[PDB]
Design brief:
The PDB classes it as membrane protein. By secondary structure, this protein is an alpha/beta fold. The protein is 58% helix and 8% strand. It has a 6-stranded mixed beta sheet. It has a 6-stranded mixed beta sheet with strand order 18-19-20-15-21-22.
Length: 1230
């Protein structure tokens, strides 16, 4: 929808000038990089000419016998047959000149690169400050229905992230795009217009490299989806098992689930291997093509193009490097296009909501302004439905009138649109049909700003803003003096309470600050409403959100000092409506009664009499991680020109010792990948060496020898291309296999240890099933980032640097030292730039947090702001707060511009100094001109590679974080361990139970609500029932007898053995549990029943017996698929009643000695309850059972009962004796 050039719609004239000057500087700066290669071409031509002359002068006196052609005296007054051949070219003077040119270009690049970034960043910052303030000013004027449709949560993201996406588009990214586009255009143009045969030839290889690069780029996305689909084959198992962990534990299926997860990790491993193979092979293919292009370019440029006489060596070098630079810049310009697309997409919502016209908004020209109003208000056939849900009509032909100076009470069912009438008389919404009038005037054509200033509302829930109490009250009326605030607080009965506060009226009351009682918040809100002395006072269920002790006080504040002005009250309870002058009952959105209280009592008053009588998930994160990791690995494709100018830009963390120790089992693959990486690192300085070797051949006097040597070097380039192909493929495959083996091992171990944790560990919100699955899917995949791949990068960089240094110091140590002085800067350039950028991003986010606070406070409770608060205040506050991000952006502009400019210019300074000194060495020390190029190029390329080695920031740190998260899990020792040592295994298990005054408190729930004093004993074969309580200990006996939690204090005795000492596996195997919600696995019905005793392969006879005993055989036997019917995800539909019998059969099949019926027989259908109660009753036979049911005594008449609802078991006995003594047990029959 939004065109790219719409993003600049907020640009001012100053912004236009800044952008124009920045673009001009970016254009000039971009010209510099390819334009310097002309100076380089002429410099290398000068070197070659001087070397030819010098070599000729070494011949022993060819012209001393005859005048001949080319001897030294050609510098003198002698008639040499080929003119002035010697003496005129002074190499040192030429190199002084060329070093001067390089230094001048360095200064120009510094200036232009600084301005380029600074001006563009400043212009973007100004434009987006303006954009944000306009956006917020527009939001606050939208009608409240628009806020019903749009969530504050999404508005916050639009305000913070989306506008930041626009910033990334109109910011320095635009300058970088301009610079790189002009650089590539100039690079290709200067190649074509210096030699078109060679430029055309070496460009003709592009289609193959394009195919390879496009293949890699496409394969990234293509393989992401295939990987995600691959892991899901195991992710489903993990999610199913973790989501139902209590049943898995209760039936001891941990081993089975671990095996089933291992069985499915193979697909993810396999797809990871294949992605590695493909991407490594294609990276090697691209490198081979690059080196074949080198060979073709040099061979053709020499043959019949240079040795024939058309070109010169300098022109050949210049053309080659210019084309390489152009292609390099073209590649670096794709991130800018990505940023432009992202920004242009995000701007759609912002601009459309900026341009949207509000249906009703706070403005000064909307309509008439009354004076001395009576306050009378009336409805006329008002019909209304909310815009967010127009299908449901809330008001139906509503007609009502509220007399001036009187209190009218609105009563009716909660869903009768009772309060929605209030939102109409302050004009939150216009009525769909009908009219609402005040003092005889229509609400329309009445100045909304003036109208709402006549109305004060006590909201349903008090809302206070983050400021002082005096300020919060002052929001009701701007010009209220302090004594007026005191008077309002006195009327609202808050003065006495507020003066008790530590700092009186100046105390901050922000919700993130000092808290206050709901009653006091309502009283300060009432003060805010009263301070404006409204003619119309709306009481919208003020007390409905308060405790009784505070309800009394708030109600006392109300109906005490309210007079003269009209009051419209929606009472929370009808005990206080009788003071009202009139009452209007609401039914299905229409007024009915419109009578006095005594008249409301004209008949049954069904509502009034009734009340008075009754009252008296991992996929997103995994996708992001996979994509980011694949993109990071793609950095190996970066190639840099020799000579020329270099590229610029293409809980505690675990110790790496632990990661490597864990990854030891796959050491051979890491070693093979390391060998490949070492060779690939060696490749770069070797091709710099071969380039310098080529340059040296052009000075050879013998043409045949020259041709032979050039052929040899081209063959070496071809061989290097082939070796690079093979080694790149080998490295990619080996490190992919190492990483995938590590990830598979990590997932298996993490799941296996995760299933060993005690149940309490799962209840913790830090270990939510979604969180656990995300940890098992994503974090496991990331740990390889701190593994072979990192080792591969380290080895690659080390070999690159060491080989380059060997070459440089072998061929010239004096020059190497000079060029090495610039080594630190060239290397640290990129790392410093990236880390400074991320630091600035963090600081900008910190600055934006303050603004987010204000914007979220304003939007979260926009109803309070509009109705009773001040609309314009928040706009001004946000406008003032928006200055901080602007200042941070300005200083970012300055610092980032300087850093970028220096990083760009430093290379030219290095060239200047190095070639100035190389000229001196050639003139005096007798170096060969080729060695100068060799040394300088080797050192520069190694410096750039080493600098790229320090760009591990985004992935390595989080890899170590994930490794730490896994290692803490693997090292945890749970309080209750399923995998613990065997013991306390008495063969003749009988199942006698006893509770010795157990105390328990649920962690992950507030440590309050302690369950205390529980003490009962159950002899073998008896049934115990916990009944009557709505909670407070009823359901925790189940989770205690089974070792889900050990008691805080006290002990649970099984056959006389303490609970904490009996081996969990054995005890839990002796118990069979049925829960309120039958949880079954996606396997077949036979498998689900067979899950009861998964330690042994029980025959189908047991399953049949259990199914018939559980009243399940006939039902399942009559299904289309019978006992092989698949459950859950298969699409087969079963009701809770049908699954409950599956669960009961599962419990029965193991022939448990203890049965825990945790509120079975709770299906929504009474028929299902009848069906399943028979199953439960048949199951209880001959076992020690603890039975819990919400149903009445009929279920539990069989055996002894406990009835208490306060933890301790005071009342206990059989149904006959319990009913005889007339205790609390009778409440079931009350």
């Amino acid at each position: 929808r939004v065109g790219f050039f719409q993003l600049f719609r907020f640009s001012s004239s100053t912004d236009i000038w800044l952008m124009f000057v920045g673009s001009l500087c970016a254009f000039l700066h971009g010209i510099a990089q390819p334009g310097v290669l002309l100076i380089f071409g002429t410099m290398t031509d000068v070197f070659i000419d001087y070397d030819v002359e010098l070599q000729e002068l070494q011949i022993p006196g060819k012209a001393c016998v005859n005048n001949t052609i080319v001897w030294t005296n050609s510098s003198l007054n002698q008639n040499m047959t080929n003119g002035t051949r010697c003496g005129l070219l002074n190499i040192e003077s030429e190199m002084i000149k060329f070093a001067s040119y390089y230094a001048g270009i360095a200064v120009a690049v510094l200036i232009t690169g600084y301005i380029q970034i600074c001006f563009w960043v400043i212009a973007a910052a100004r434009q987006i400050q303006k954009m944000r303030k306009f956006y917020f000013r527009r939001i606050m004027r939208m009608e409240i229905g628009w806020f019903d449709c749009n969530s504050v949560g999404e508005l916050n993201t639009r305000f913070s992230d989306d506008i930041n996406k626009i910033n990334d588009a109109i910011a320095d990214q635009m300058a970088l795009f301009i610079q790189r586009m002009t650089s590539t255009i100039c690079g290709f143009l200067l190649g074509f217009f210096r030699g078109w045969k060679l430029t055309l030839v070496i460009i003709s290889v592009s289609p193959l490299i394009g195919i390879g690069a496009a293949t890699i780029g496409l394969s990234v996305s293509k393989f992401t989806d295939y990987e995600l689909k691959a892991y899901a084959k195991a992710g489903v198992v993990a999610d199913e098992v973790i989501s139902s962990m209590r049943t898995v534990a209760a039936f001891g299926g941990e081993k089975r689930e671990v095996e089933r997860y291992e069985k499915n990790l193979v697909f993810a491993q396999r797809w990871g291997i294949r992605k590695g193979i493909v991407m490594g092979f294609f990276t090697g293919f691209v490198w081979c093509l690059i080196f074949l292009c080198y060979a073709l370019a040099f061979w053709y440029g020499s043959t019949l193009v240079l040795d024939e006489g058309e070109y010169t060596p300098g022109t050949l070098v210049q053309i080659f490097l210019s084309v390489i630079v152009g292609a390099l810049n073209l590649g670096n310009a794709s991130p800018c296009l990505e940023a432009f697309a992202t920004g242009r997409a995000a701007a759609t919502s912002i601009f459309e909501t900026i341009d949207r016209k509000p249906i009703i908004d706070c403005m000064s020209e909307d309509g008439y302004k009354l004076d001395r109003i009576k306050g009378e208000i009336e409805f006329h056939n008002v019909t209304f439905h909310y815009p967010s849900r127009p299908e449901v009509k809330i008001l139906n032909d509503l007609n009502m009138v509220i007399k001036p100076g009187e209190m009218t009470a609105l009563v009716g069912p909660s869903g009768a649109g009772k309060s929605t009438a209030l939102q109409l008389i302050q004009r939150f919404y216009d009525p769909c049909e009908g009219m609402v009038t005040v003092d005889g005037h229509d609400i329309r054509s009445l100045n909304i700003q003036w109208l709402r200033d006549q109305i004060g509302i006590v909201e349903q829930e008090p809302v206070l803003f983050s400021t002082t109490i005096a300020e919060n009250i002052r929001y009701g009326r701007e010009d209220a003096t302090m004594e007026d605030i005191v008077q309002a607080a006195k009327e609202a009965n808050a003065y006495n309470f507020i003066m008790d506060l530590p700092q009186q009226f100046d105390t901050l009351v922000g919700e993130g600050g000092g808290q206050m009682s709901g009653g006091q918040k309502q009283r300060v809100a009432i003060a805010r409403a009263l301070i404006r002395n409204p003619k119309i006072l709306l009481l919208d269920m003020a007390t409905s959100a308060l405790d009784n002790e505070s309800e009394a006080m708030v109600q006392e504040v109300l109906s005490k000092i309210q007079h003269g002005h009209t009051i419209i009250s929606v009472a929370h309870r009808l005990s206080t409506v009788r003071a009202a002058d009139t009452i209007i009952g609401f039914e299905h959105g229409t007024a009915v009664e419109r009578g006095t209280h005594e008249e409301l009592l004209e008949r049954k008053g069904v509502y009034f009499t009734l009340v008075t009588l009754q009252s008296q998930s991992y996929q997103d994160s995994l996708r992001a991680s996979i994509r980011q990791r694949s993109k990071s690995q793609l950095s190996y494709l970066v190639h840099e020109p020799p000579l020329a100018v270099v590229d610029h830009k293409s809980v505690e963390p675990a110790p790496v010792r632990r990661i490597l120790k864990f990854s030891a089992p796959e050491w051979p693959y890491m070693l093979v990948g390391s060998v490949g990486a070492a060779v690939n690192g060696t490749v770069t300085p070797l091709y710099a060496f071969l380039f310098s070797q080529i340059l040296g051949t052009f000075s050879i006097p013998d043409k045949e020898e020259q041709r032979s040597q050039i052929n040899g070097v081209c063959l070496l380039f071809v061989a290097m291309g082939c070796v690079s192909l093979f080694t790149q493929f080998l490295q990619g495959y080996a490190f992919a296999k190492s990483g995938e083996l590590l990830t598979k091992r990590l997932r298996k171990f993490g799941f296996r240890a995760m299933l060993g944790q005690d149940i309490a560990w799962f209840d913790d919100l830090r270990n939510s099933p979604g969180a656990l699955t995300t940890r098992l899917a994503t974090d496991a995949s990331q740990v390889q980032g701190a593994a072979g791949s990192q080792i591969g990068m380290i080895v690659n960089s080390f070999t690159n640097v060491t080989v380059a240094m060997i070459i440089a110091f072998s061929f010239s140590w004096k020059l190497s030292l000079v060029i090495l002085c610039f080594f630190p800067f060239l290397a640290l350039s990129g790392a410093t730039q990236t880390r400074m950028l991320t630091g600035f991003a963090s600081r900008d986010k910190q600055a934006l947090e303050m603004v987010g606070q204000i914007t979220n406070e304003a939007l979260s409770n926009i109803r309070t702001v509009a109705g009773i608060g001040k609309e314009r205040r928040f706009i001004e506050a946000l406008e003032t707060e928006l200055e901080k991000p602007f200042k941070t952006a300005i200083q970012k502009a300055n610092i980032y511009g300087f850093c970028f400019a220096f990083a760009q210019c430093i290379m030219f300074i290095a060239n200047s100094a190095s070639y100035r000194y190389g000229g001196y060495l050639i003139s005096n020390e007798g170096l060969h001109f080729s060695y100068v190029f060799r040394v300088i190029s080797a050192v520069v390329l190694s410096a750039t590679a080493l600098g790229r080695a320090f760009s591990y920031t985004p992935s390595y740190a989080k890899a170590k974080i994930s490794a730490a998260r896994f290692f803490q899990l693997l090292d945890r020792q749970p309080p209750i361990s399923v995998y613990n040592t065997a013991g306390e295994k008495w063969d003749n298990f009988q199942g006698k139970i006893d509770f010795v005054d157990c105390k328990f408190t649920y962690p992950s729930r507030p440590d309050s609500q302690v369950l205390n004093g529980l003490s009962v004993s159950i002899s073998p074969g008896q049934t115990l029932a916990f009944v009557g309580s709505s909670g407070c200990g009823k359901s925790t006996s189940i989770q205690l007898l089974e070792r889900f939690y050990d008691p805080d204090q006290g002990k649970v005795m099984i056959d006389g053995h303490d609970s904490k000492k009996v081996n969990v596996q054995f005890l839990r195997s002796n118990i069979g549990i049925v829960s309120q919600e039958p949880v079954l696995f996606a396997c077949s019905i036979m498998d689900n029943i067979k899950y009861g005793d998964n330690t042994k392969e029980i025959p189908m006879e047991r399953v049949i017996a259990a199914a018939k005993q559980a009243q399940l055989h006939d039902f399942v036997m009559s299904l289309p698929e019978k006992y092989e019917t698949n459950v859950g995800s298969q699409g087969s539909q079963l009701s809770r009643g049908e699954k409950q019998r599956i669960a009961i059969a599962r419990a029965i099949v193991r022939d448990p000695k203890i049965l825990l019926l945790d509120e079975a027989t709770s299906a929504l259908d009474t028929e299902s309850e009848k069906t399943v109660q028979v199953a439960l009753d048949k199951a209880r036979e001959g076992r020690t059972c603890i039975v819990i049911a919400h149903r009445l005594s009929t279920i539990q008449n069989a055996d002894i009962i406990a009835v208490m609802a306060q933890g301790v078991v005071i009342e206990k006995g059989t149904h006959e004796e319990l009913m005889a003594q007339k205790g609390a047990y009778y409440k079931l029959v009350t």
